[PDB]
Amino acid sequence: MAAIEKRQKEIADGLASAERAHKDLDLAKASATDQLKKAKAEAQVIIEQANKR
Predict the structure, then answer these.
(1) SS3 breakdown of the chain: % helix, strand, coil, rounded to 5?
(2) So what family is this one in?
(3) Domain span including residue 22
(4) From CA 7, how far away is CA 35, in angstroms rounded?
(5) CB of 40 within 8 A of CB of 33?
(6) Number of structural domains, the chain?
């Protein structure tokens, strides 16, 4: 459906495509969480949530 009949090293496209996406989403989520936490904590005072321990 994607590759008709022309492709050699797909790992490359998948690496850059998966890397750029993973990094993008990661930075996005992190930025949001940090931004929200910062704003909230700044509003007055709010504890933090433990995702692990």
Answers:
(1) 65, 0, 35
(2) Belongs to the ATPase B chain family.
(3) 1-53
(4) 42
(5) no
(6) 1
| CB atoms inside a 10 Å sphere around CB 37 | 13
- Alpha carbon distance, N-terminus to C-terminus of the chain: 45
Closest CA to 37 of 48, 27, 29, 26: 48
E-assigned strands of 1-53?
none
Q: Which structural technique was applied?
A: NMR
Closest CA to 47 of 36, 37, 32: 37
Please tell me the distance from the alpha carbon of residue 36 to that of residue 19, in angstroms, as a whole number. Answer: 25
- Residue in the block written with tokens 């850059």: 16
CA–CA separation, 25 and 28 (whole Å)? 5
